[model samples]
Target: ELFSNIWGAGTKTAQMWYQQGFRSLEDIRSQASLTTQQAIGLKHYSDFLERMPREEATEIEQTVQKAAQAFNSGLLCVACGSYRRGKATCGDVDVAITHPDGRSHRGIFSRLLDSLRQEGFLTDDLVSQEENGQQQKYLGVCRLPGPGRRHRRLDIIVVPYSEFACALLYFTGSAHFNRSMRALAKTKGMSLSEHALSTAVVRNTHGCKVGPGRVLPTPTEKDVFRLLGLPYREPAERDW
Candidate 1:
């Protein structure tokens, strides 16, 4: 359990530690060969475990916004998740980033992340992946400088402007609402995902997509709803 608390280390690593006679956090603390992320995770384990209020989330978002712009002023960084959903508090912060010109967003992920790390704002990274060669995602922990700040989970996804609206809707989701929207799209012979909404999707008997279909233009959230034959619902009304 103690070993599992290390960010990159999971249950498999925990079992490995146990077999090696490490019975406690102190044992791993003194002996484990830790990665940069795991070391930070161990040092701030308690802080990272705590949930942040909306105020803290907003401050973190602003910190990211300012840092990202310093690297590339055209980059768009919006706080999504429950924060964008107008929740009074948030478990963590999720920011969706893109650029109007599309091309500028290409290398912004690594650059912005490096800048944030140098400023001591980004703490650790848990997941980083690319989507269909277009969007990039980072899941990590961050903390505002100065005293009394908890390490909060932070996620940033950088996409092209062409997919901004769908990306925004997916990341701003209340989960259930996104599932409902996707299901509705399926019934209409279309497919919806975080990347883009598309048409002519072929589904198997189990409702699984066997063919990816063709990408559709969704320049706005209203366009997405409109294409599926539903009226637009504001983000506030999407809690279901």
Candidate 2:
């Protein structure tokens, strides 16, 4: 069961191990040829498995905020997800980074990631890198320095300031709330996504964006709901 619960291990792999008389973490540690990802997962199993205290999540957010500011001042760094929603505990940290001067955020993703790695704050790579239009995403593990700190999942999403509000709303989601909002947008003949809220979306009976749609101006989170004719709901109230 312990082996099965390791990051990348699943039912079949654990079953295989059990059949081969490997019943413990030590057995896999001593014998299995683990991938780099799996090796890191196994090594930090205890740390990664634990939920983060709200305060710890805030600490990490501050750490990331400072690091990002050091890399480029005036960077708008915010911790989204459960933390933004005022959850008492967090399963992982999701950060959204941007700069008021949109151009500054353009090339900062790679540099920011490299900086975190160099600082030894980032511990393991999951989806270490991804890019979509003006947005970039990093999924990985990180740890704070201390006597008894845990390795925690960390996701950083960098977007241009122009897209910050939409990105923030999407990332701060309680999933159900997001779906309901999107469904409402569709009803209004608009489409909402992390990137933009677009108007005149012509979807077929099967929901597909057959119409590319014109993007609505979304300078702030309020703009998104306002354009959709929805009363603004604060992040704390978005947990549906």
Candidate 3:
């Protein structure tokens, strides 16, 4: 899975890449050929493998926050993942964007991305405008303007305002906490996901969801906890 560990690689791509006789990150550059985007992955392969300091993570988050606000003052952007979880170092950063009015978040993802690129902040796109249900995402690389700065893996995604709370909860996870919450949801005939927590979910014998149950009103992360009948855990507390 070495090649698969790259930003935009898959298992199939990993196998194909290894069969080409490349083993190390640097080997990919001289011993192999790659697309523009894949080469960006190579250029930053080592950096991507390293965890960024919290200060660097916050710097980028604030940069995105300002750009998103400039595009639409109503829009909100926050960094999730270990960053939100209060980690000292982060493998990558996920910037979550939403608008209070919901529809204002639309059409701003691309424009905001372009502005970041214009600022020479965002360097390469692994994929841009990629859709995940109703969410729009950009998986790419970025660097802050400084002499020793390095390209780092970055994601910017926007979800509809109605789904903001759940999306934030999901992305702010420590994985184990998310799984625990979802398991709790299942015990009460509910389903939890990045979109929304639903009631009366129907699951098949394999424990797969058979139907999209009715969505609950989740206007805040605390609301999600309240709906599940669980106490609110701050992002840092969820690190467990």
RMSD of each: 4.8, 3.9, 4.3
Ten residues in a row with the worst lDDT in model 3? 1-10
Q: TM-score winner among the candidates?
A: 3
Model 1 stretches with alpha carbons more than 4 Å out? 1-45, 128-132, 201-212
**Tens digits of lDDT, candidate 1, 127-229:** 6554555888888888889998778888888888998999899999989999999999989888899888998866889999898667889999999999999
How does each model score on TM-score?
A: 0.78, 0.83, 0.84
Query: For each candidate, what is the lDDT?
Result: 0.84, 0.87, 0.87
Worst 10 residues of 2 by lDDT: 32-41
Per-structure clash totals for the candidates: 0, 0, 0
- Model 3: per-residue lDDT, tens digit, 185-218? 9988889999999998668899999886678899
lDDT of the structure predicted as candidate 3? 0.87
